[PDB]
């Protein structure tokens, strides 16, 4: 149980939640900050 629990955590790092890509560096290095704001909002809510 314990192991399986945190395994799902790790798999949660590859889910979009609605952004344009699950990896943060892509959003940081492809969008101007006023829209990176929106994308990072979505990702942060999901992971929280």
């Amino acid at each position: 149980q314990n192991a399986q629990a945190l395994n799902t955590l790790v798999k949660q790092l590859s889910s979009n939640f609605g952004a344009i890509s699950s990896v943060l560096n892509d959003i940081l290095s492809r969008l101007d900050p006023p829209e990176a704001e929106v994308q990072i909002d979505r990702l942060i809510t999901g992971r929280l």
Partner: protein, 48 residues
């Protein structure tokens, strides 16, 4: 991106400043001629 003699230059999904540092798989240039400001009519997901 700084030769602003064009009429409309709008990038979707990419911020113009951060274009100098990305290795794309491929690009497609699609060209045509249309009268009036039908640039607004041709919008992703929009109608017209």
């Amino acid at each position: 991106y700084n030769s602003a003699s064009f009429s409309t230059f709008k990038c979707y999904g990419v911020s113009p400043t951060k274009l100098n540092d990305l290795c794309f798989t491929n690009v497609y240039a699609d060209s045509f001629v249309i009268r009036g400001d039908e640039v607004r009519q041709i919008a992703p997901g929009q109608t017209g």
